[PDB]
Design a protein around this ligand. Structure first.
Ligand SMILES: Nc1nc2c(ncn2[C@H]2C[C@H](O)[C@@H](COP(=O)(O)O)O2)c(=O)[nH]1
Ligand SMILES: [Mg+2]
Ligand SMILES: [Zn+2]
Ligand SMILES: [Zn+2]
Lengths: 98, 79, 50, 1358
RNA sequence: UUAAACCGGCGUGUGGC
DNA sequence: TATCCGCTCACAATGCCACACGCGCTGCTCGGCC
DNA sequence: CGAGCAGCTACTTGTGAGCGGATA
């Protein structure tokens, strides 16, 4: 199975999983740790955030790659904003400083 | 092709500043539209940048020097 | 997960799925039969003195 | 873009600001049209438009009306994304308490109110009341009342008495609760009283109050007033056809909550009964605290099919929560997966990849390359062309994958090598081709494993995979110095068959002119592959400078290795190839090649090795046959002899001579000896029975058997496996581990019995389940260890601090466990290395020890080297470059930036595959013999004794009055090679510094009953032993001489408790003899349960045991010692019987007897004795009254705990013990791990510390503050004349280590999420995201690899 | 106002490594 | 009135992948602001 | 009239900490 761009979940902007639906594989946590053992901070933020998380960021990357520009802009992960909204939906406040 | 890059690290230490200099060099090669300092064999931009670093032509210091030269060129062009 | 010597002829020791559950999922032997109460019995040849 | 994240409590006004509309109806959406209800859960005027740039009524749909509201709905028309950030709230008529601060164990509201949890629980559920504004009444304010208590106490005070019930009463208590007055009152109370538990509780309370008075928080915010709801996009209602609907879990809870709230709001207006509105408030509170966290209530509610309704707390915790499923590990789009296949013609630096996968994974690259060429004007034409599968798309694919590396990945990732970079080549089919040599690095056979592949997709990513992830750059193991590119069974078998020479073959005794001539003669078939021939070789040797001396010389070698010489490069010598090639041989060959020739030619060398090995294994004839496995001739004879022996044993048992236990112990070793005999028989039958003549009589040789060819080369077969194959299978065992008495007298070549095979499969099913059930605990342990690790980054080059540890080889136990070099190769010394001659500095300070350095050290035979270590580092937030050592993978000094913590965790978590989860036994299933060991000394040297407290007897031996005396052997050079523990009062037949030969009995043992020595001669009397109170009359029946049995402390009554038996060594007159050098009266106070066999008025001799006190002979509490061993070691759990040691030096004495348990007084010589300890009575006592011991000495005999050891022996002692025991554990299995990983882990373990004396510092004495923080703070305090503080390090397990971190996100991803969340919320924590895991969850660069440098630029910019 | 272009949430069971 | 001893509850338990299925019927009562 | 509520288990084990408690 191989997927380039397919459907995305609506609760979290992330690709689906499985062969029935057009879903890619799941970059596991130990895989993130193995990347951390190496460098690849750029690679990590492209795979985790750009290639997986932000629809705005991933569309920008798609447009840049189909334009001949190996430039990346990570931005912020949308799922992290989802967790912020969850833990903010309780009596616990959380904010990002300057 | 380039099998290993250890000789790129023995002269550019820490194996991580090589990453930065290769990033900037290949970024100036792809979009900046500069000229490869060695006759390539029709390969990727990353590996020609790495190989130009390999011939002792590009490091971080000469990269900053070329950036300063480009800045002076911009100053002279703006006039 | 381990097999008892009482499984001789009633529970096959070499047939079990490898993975999450080993020994929890067994296979009934060939000649094994269920008992009236619900136990597992095995046929044996009755041997007299000679 | 943004700096540190701040977390605090939420105020109702902040929630109202967050909200964009109150939801007043539990109706979800309209029935006919799917527009949301006007003010239901789903809404548009509250959250946003359901369609992009389209309102609900459809009036405004163009771009001009973008940003204006309608006339009836009032919805700002915009995109759907707005329904993610915008949220609503629920206005509750009654307040409610937050369950997270109620049952957090410990709670936050209970500690704030100084009231336990049970009373608040009874109050909140309306079974009890609580009063407020007492005043003139007789009742206290903080007390609780029940229904009858509120009934009877209502008549005494009606107007001034206030008793609210429910969350309103709690809110009123929180509002009228002062903080500064409470703070000063608690400070005064802490200053007044003196207790342990009270002081701890007061410190916890004053810190909980300090977090409130300092940060901008309010207690009343703990009681919730408005329910913040979740956006609908996060809890969707997708169109499942029919009445059946695919829903989220939270929606039913919101429905129930809104229904209960509406019913409560309508009940108060109708003047409903008080008990009815009370039960309604109770139902609302239950709904609320089940919506916050279901399961923390006394009973978890459920929706359907007995499935508990998932809550918000559930949506965070667990493996399905965000922290584990959608934030740390997420699904990437570009990802292929397939089965692995072998490539025997591809180079090590490349790999294979299917065609369809290469097409699907690089669609945008193909699109760009097509748009660059004058082929496809638009992207739709290019998409149609790539979907039509034309031939013009193929050459573009060859162009885009010419130099585009990809990322190969394994599903279980243990170490950093599980992920690699590879240059793909297009192969037809649907499977991934992979290099066979790298497979051993993945630990993934070809039995159906599925591997994944990702694309870098970015310039930085491509060159990063090339630089730091290429397979060529990763050839050495990150754990030890052995190469991970070790050849596998096929190529090593081919090479072994090639270089294995015979006695007579085609072309024997001829002469060859070169390797090419040898290859030509072998391919021509005139000469065989193995023939002793005189050939000429031209080798190259490396000089001192960069030169290659070429020399041509004649050798007597085989044609096979002659052909193999064409593969070997010039620099390698010829002695490395002129051998019978084995696994270890070729491993050390590749190691030497990488050492001498570097990394550039080693890759192509190994590639050509694999090539020629596969080629000459294909041209080989290696195969197994039934004639290739012979049966030992004397096997049946040995079997029959063992049968006769066991029949004689059975006859002896039937005769009534031997019992069952000695029979069980005597049949097992007999059958084991028979098994060893038949194994040696099979082994000699394997290395012989093929004798071939060379132009004459028969001659012997290596005598292969085409299976011995496999087992001897170390390729795939072992000695024990082929031993079970051809010879006896061996003894089989039972579930518990009891080896059965009836072995298996059959082998694989012959038939087996049904019962034999039954026992075999019974023994093997458990071994199969071993790995399947152990991989779980292995993954859990490696997850815990990576969590505690990876909070460090080497950032300093050098610190100049010389605080290090002295590396000593493992000499305890056996003869030699591992040499010193393996513990020091690749380290930077703290103090300069000295030669065996004093004052000779051969190695200076702050330098890396290469191979030549340790070689010269071994030549000099240095015993102890003071090297720098991570545990003794003096750097804040990270380690120094010249403090760790070598990379163990790159032949140079460690670099600056790489996080060695991840490498350590992976190198100590990976070898768990070869470990055991549960063993048959840890130190032998048979009970350990009570001082019946027959160990001896092998080498010849001088004897040394540590902490010498011993005397000499009249028989010429040496007796010892101490326990911690260790014996050591200093060889003729000066190094220590042997060391052992000396028992109490052991018979030492030698002395100190005596040159004794190896193989002599040096010491004897005293049995389970403990002795006591007589340091000097004299007389003995019954001093302070009256007959009838402290001693009883028990007469012996086999000796006649009666033995006085002294009662213990638990059986004797109070009449004899105030009397302790003691022996006073006197002379013929009666005056006490003195200890030589001391004016202490010599008396030995006898403890309970003593067997006084010695009578009165007898002249005792020196070293003669007086009282034989019993002991636990066979009762041992040894640890299971498997992987649970390392689990307990990193958890630092207290053993069942911890041996309490001496914290302070000086004399010791006893105090009050049977105050629950026995006390212990330790009087030093400098100060007083303010340190007392309680001692259980079921353990043996080693130290006595007249014995003075240094701090760190034992009091009882048994396993030691690390907690006390850390504070009563130092920092280096506890970590040395830890690394020694963990190395013994890893060595009993046969896995090598460099200690540096354990050192850095245990360094991260002791990161916390406590304060004894605050001094001029701002930290209190009851604060567990991180060590580097107080080090930085005390440095400024030490700058002036004021004293800083008195810090004390404390060691805790790995579980609490990750939780006690100043960063909360790193702990929130770990277990125990709600507790750490509440702790960080009530304190107003602000973590500076200066870590690794937090930088991953936030999604930016990492301050370990590349981003580290970038983050430096970030640090200097900010 | 007009014209053109584009537009898997949960549980369960099984099996494999 | 302090100090251990025992009761009671929370929290946790490799990672992936593949496949498949099932997540109900009808009566009452309450919500009412298009 | 529509929607929501509701009526027709017993072997997990360890580890740990907080809370009686009992006993001088
Ligand atoms: N005449 C008129 N009917 C309306 C208006 N808005 C809504 N309606 C009608 C259509 C709906 O089907 C009905 C109420 O349906 P239901 O009870 O929510 O009211 C309006 O502005 N005018
Ligand atoms: Mg496999
Ligand atoms: Zn509208
Ligand atoms: Zn240091």
């Amino acid at each position: 199975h191989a997927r380039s761009t397919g459907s995305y979940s609506l609760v979290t902007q992330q690709p689906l999983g499985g062969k029935a639906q057009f879903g890619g594989q799941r970059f596991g946590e130990m895989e993130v740790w193995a990347l951390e053992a190496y460098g690849a901070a750029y690679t990590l933020q492209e795979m985790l955030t750009v290639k997986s998380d932000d629809v705005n960021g991933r569309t920008k990357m798609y447009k840049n790659i189909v334009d001949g520009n190996h430039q990346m802009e990570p931005g912020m992960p949308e799922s992290f904003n989802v967790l912020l909204k969850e833990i903010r939906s309780l009596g616990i406040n959380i904010e990002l400083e300057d | 092709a380039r099998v290993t890059v250890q000789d790129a690290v023995e002269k550019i230490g820490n194996r991580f500043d090589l990453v930065l200099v290769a990033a900037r060099r290949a970024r100036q090669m792809q979009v900046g539209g500069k000229d490869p300092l060695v006759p390539e064999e029709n390969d990727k931009t990353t590996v020609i940048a790495l190989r130009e670093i390999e011939e002792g032509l590009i490091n971080n210091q000469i990269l900053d020097v070329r950036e300063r030269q480009e800045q002076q060129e911009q100053e002279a062009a703006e006039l | 997960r381990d097999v008892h010597p009482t499984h001789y002829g009633r529970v096959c020791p070499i047939e079990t799925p490898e993975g999450p559950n080993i020994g929890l999922i067994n296979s009934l032997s060939v000649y094994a039969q269920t008992n009236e109460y619900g136990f597992l019995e095995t046929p044996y040849r009755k041997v007299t003195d000679g | 873009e943004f700096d540190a994240i701040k977390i605090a409590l939420a105020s109702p006004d902040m929630i109202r600001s967050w909200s964009f509309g109150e939801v007043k109806k539990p109706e979800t959406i309209n029935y006919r049209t799917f527009k949301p209800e006007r003010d239901g859960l789903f809404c548009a005027r509250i959250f946003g438009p359901v369609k992009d740039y389209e309102c609900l009524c459809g009036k405004y749909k163009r771009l001009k009306h973008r940003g204006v509201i309608c006339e009836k709905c009032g919805v700002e028309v915009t995109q759907t994304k707005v329904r993610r950030e915008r949220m609503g709230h629920i206005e509750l008529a009654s307040p409610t308490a937050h369950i997270w601060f109620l049952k957090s164990l410990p709670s936050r509201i209970g500690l704030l109110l100084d009231m336990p949890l049970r009373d608040i629980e009874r109050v909140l559920y309306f079974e009890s009341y609580v009063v407020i504004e007492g005043g003139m009444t007789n009742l206290e304010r903080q007390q609780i009342l029940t229904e009858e208590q509120y009934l009877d106490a209502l008549e005494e005070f009606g107007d001034e008495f206030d008793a609210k019930m429910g969350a309103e009463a709690i809110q009123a208590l929180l509002k009228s609760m002062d903080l500064e007055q409470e703070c000063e009152q608690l400070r005064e109370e802490l200053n007044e009283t003196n207790s342990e538990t009270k002081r701890k509780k007061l410190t916890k309370r004053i810190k909980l109050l300090e977090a409130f008075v300092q940060s901008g928080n309010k207690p009343e915010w703990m009681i919730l007033t408005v329910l913040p709801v979740l956006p609908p996009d996060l809890r969707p209602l997708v169109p499942l056809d029919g009445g059946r609907f695919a829903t989220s879990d939270l929606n039913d809870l919101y429905r129930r909550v809104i229904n209960r709230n509406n019913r409560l709001k309508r009940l108060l207006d109708l003047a409903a009964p008080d008990i009815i509105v009370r039960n309604e408030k109770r139902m609302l509170q239950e709904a609320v605290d089940a919506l916050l966290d279901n399961g923390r209530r006394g009973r978890a509610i459920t929706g359907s099919n007995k499935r508990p309704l998932k809550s918000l707390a559930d949506m965070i915790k667990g493996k399905q929560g965000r922290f584990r499923q959608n934030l740390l590990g997420k699904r990437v789009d570009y990802s292929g997966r397939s089965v692995i296949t072998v490539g025997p013609y591809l180079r090590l630096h490349q790999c294979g990849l299917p065609k369809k996968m290469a097409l699907e994974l690089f669609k945008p690259f193909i699109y760009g390359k097509l748009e660059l060429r004058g082929l496809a004007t638009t992207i739709k034409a290019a998409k149609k062309m790539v979907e039509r599968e034309e031939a013009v798309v193929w050459d573009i694919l060859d162009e885009v994958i010419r130099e585009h590396p990809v990322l190969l990945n394994r599903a279980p990732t243990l170490h950093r090598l599980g992920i690699q970079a590879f240059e793909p080549v297009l192969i037809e089919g649907k499977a991934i081709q992979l290099h066979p040599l790298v497979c051993a690095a993945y630990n993934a056979d070809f039995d159906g494993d599925q591997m994944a592949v990702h694309v870098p997709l970015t310039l930085e990513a491509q060159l990063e995979a090339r630089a730091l992830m290429m397979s060529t750059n990763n050839i050495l193991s990150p754990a030890n110095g052995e190469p991970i590119i070790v050849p596998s069974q096929d190529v090593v078998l081919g090479l072994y068959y090639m270089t294995r020479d015979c006695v007579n073959a085609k072309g024997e005794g001829m002469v060859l002119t070169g390797p090419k001539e040898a290859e030509r003669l072998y391919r021509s078939g005139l000469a065989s592959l193995h023939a002793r021939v005189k050939v000429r070789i031209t080798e190259y040797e490396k000089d001192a400078n960069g030169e290659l001396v070429a020399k041509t010389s004649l050798k007597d070698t085989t044609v096979g290795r002659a052909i193999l010489w064409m593969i070997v490069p010039k620099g390698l010598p010829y002695s490395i190839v002129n051998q019978a090639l084995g696994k270890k041989a070729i491993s050390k060959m590749l190691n030497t090649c990488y050492r001498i020739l570097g990394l550039k030619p080693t890759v192509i060398f190994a590639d050509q090795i694999m090539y020629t090995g596969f080629a000459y294994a294909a041209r080989s004839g290696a195969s197994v046959g039934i004639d290739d496995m012979v049966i030992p001739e004397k096997k049946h004879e040995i079997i029959s002899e063992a049968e006769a022996e066991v029949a004689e044993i059975q006859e002896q048992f039937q005769s009534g001579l031997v019992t069952a236990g000695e029979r069980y112990n005597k049949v097992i070793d007999i059958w084991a000896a028979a098994n060893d005999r038949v194994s040696k028989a099979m082994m000699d039958n394997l290395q012989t029975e093929t004798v071939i003549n060379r132009d004459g009589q028969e001659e012997k040789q290596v005598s292969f058997n085409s299976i011995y060819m496999m087992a001897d080369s170390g390729a795939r077969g072992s000695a024990a496996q082929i031993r079970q194959l051809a010879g006896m299978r061996g003894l089989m065992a039972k579930p518990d581990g009891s080896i059965i008495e009836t072995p298996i007298t059959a082998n694989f070549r012959e038939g087996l019995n049904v019962l034999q095979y039954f026992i075999s499969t019974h023994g093997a099913r458990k071994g199969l389940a071993d790995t399947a059930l152990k991989t779980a605990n292995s993954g859990y342990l490696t997850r815990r260890l990576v969590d505690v690790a990876q909070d460090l980054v080497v950032t300093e080059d050098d610190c100049g601090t010389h605080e290090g540890i002295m590396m000593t080889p493992v000499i305890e136990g056996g003869d030699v466990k591992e040499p010193l070099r393996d513990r020091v190769l690749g380290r930077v010394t703290a103090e300069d290395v000295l030669k065996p001659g004093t004052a000779d500095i051969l190695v200076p300070r702050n330098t890396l020890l290469h191979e030549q350095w340790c070689d010269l050290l071994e030549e000099n035979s240095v015993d102890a080297v003071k090297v720098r270590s991570v545990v003794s580092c003096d750097t804040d937030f990270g380690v120094c470059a010249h403090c760790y050592g070598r990379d163990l993978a790159r032949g140079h000094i460690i670099n600056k930036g790489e996080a060695i913590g991840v490498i350590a965790a992976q190198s100590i978590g990976e070898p768990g595959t070869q470990l055991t989860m549960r063993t048959f036994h840890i130190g032998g299933a048979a009970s350990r013999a009570a001082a019946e060991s027959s160990i001896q000394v092998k080498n010849k040297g001088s004897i040394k004794l540590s902490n010498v407290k011993s005397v000499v007897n009249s028989s010429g031996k040496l007796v010892i009055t101490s326990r911690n005396t260790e014996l050591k052997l200093i060889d003729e050079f000066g190094r220590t090679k042997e060391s052992y523990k000396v028992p109490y009062g052991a018979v030492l037949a030698k002395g100190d510094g005596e040159q004794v030969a190896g193989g002599e009995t040096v010491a004897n043992w005293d049995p389970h009953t403990m002795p006591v020595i007589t340091e000097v001669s004299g007389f003995v009397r019954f001093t302070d032993m009256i007959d009838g109170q402290t001693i009883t009359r028990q007469t012996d029946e086999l000796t006649g001489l009666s033995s006085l049995v002294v009662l213990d402390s638990a059986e004797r009554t109070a009449g004899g408790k105030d009397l302790r038996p003691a022996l006073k060594i006197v002379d013929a007159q009666g005056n006490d003899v003195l200890i030589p050098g001391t004016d202490m009266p010599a008396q030995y106070f006898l403890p309970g349960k003593a067997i006084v066999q010695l009578e009165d008025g007898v002249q005792i001799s020196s070293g003669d045991t007086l009282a034989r006190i019993p002991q636990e002979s066979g009762g041992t509490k040894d640890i299971t010692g498997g992987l649970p061993r390392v689990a307990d070691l990193f958890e630092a759990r207290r053993p069942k019987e911890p041996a309490i040691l001496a914290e302070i030096s000086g004399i010791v004495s006893f105090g009050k007897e049977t105050k629950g348990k026995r006390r212990l007084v330790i009087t030093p010589v400098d100060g007083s004795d303010p340190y007392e300890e309680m001692i259980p009575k079921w353990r043996q006592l080693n130290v006595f009254e007249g014995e003075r011991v240094e701090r760190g000495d034992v009091i009882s005999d048994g396993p030691e705990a690390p907690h006390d050891i850390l504070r009563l022996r130092g920092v280096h002692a506890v970590t040395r013990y830890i690394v020694n025991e963990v190395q013994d554990v890893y060595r009993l299995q046969g896995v090598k791990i460099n200690d540096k990983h354990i050192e850095v882990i245990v360094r991260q373990m002791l990161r916390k510390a406590t304060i004894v004396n605050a001094g001029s510092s701002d930290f209190l004495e009851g604060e567990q503050v991180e060590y580097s923080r107080v080090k930085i703070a005390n440095r400024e305090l030490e700058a002036n004349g004021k004293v800083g503080a008195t810090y004390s390090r404390d060691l805790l397990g790995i579980t609490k280590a990750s939780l006690a971190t100043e960063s909360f996100i790193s702990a929130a991803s770990f277990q125990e999420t709600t507790r750490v969340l509440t702790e960080a919320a009530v304190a107003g924590k602000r973590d500076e995201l200066r870590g690794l895991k937090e930088n991953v969850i936030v999604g930016r660069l990492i301050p370990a690899g590349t981003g580290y440098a970038y983050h430096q630029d970030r640090m200097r910019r900010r």
